[PDB]
Copies of this chain bind each other. A is one copy, B any other.
């Protein structure tokens, strides 16, 4: 089957939680009275590439307005 296929951010993010591994010194370097839970999750399922794309789109509209119409 040669149907055009790809992979999105959510599909990769699904495995991101498994990226960290255990070892004796895997702990925060800063002083703190609290302990952040080891399996805490995040609301948005982003990866570097997709984060960049969504911000790049915003920048285009913003700078376009500033350089063109607003300047005119």
Contacts and interface: CB of A to CB of B under 8 A. Distances in A.
Interface of A: 60-70
Copies of this chain in the oligomer: 2
Contacts of A61: 63-64, 67-68
A63 B59 CA distance: 12
20 contacts: A60-B60, A60-B63, A60-B64, A61-B63, A61-B64, A61-B67, A61-B68, A62-B64, A62-B68, A63-B64, A64-B64, A64-B65, A64-B68, A65-B65, A65-B68, A65-B69, A65-B70, A66-B69, A69-B69, A69-B70
Across chains A and B, which 5 residue pairs bring their CB atoms closest together, nearest first? A64-B64, A65-B69, A65-B68, A61-B64, A61-B68
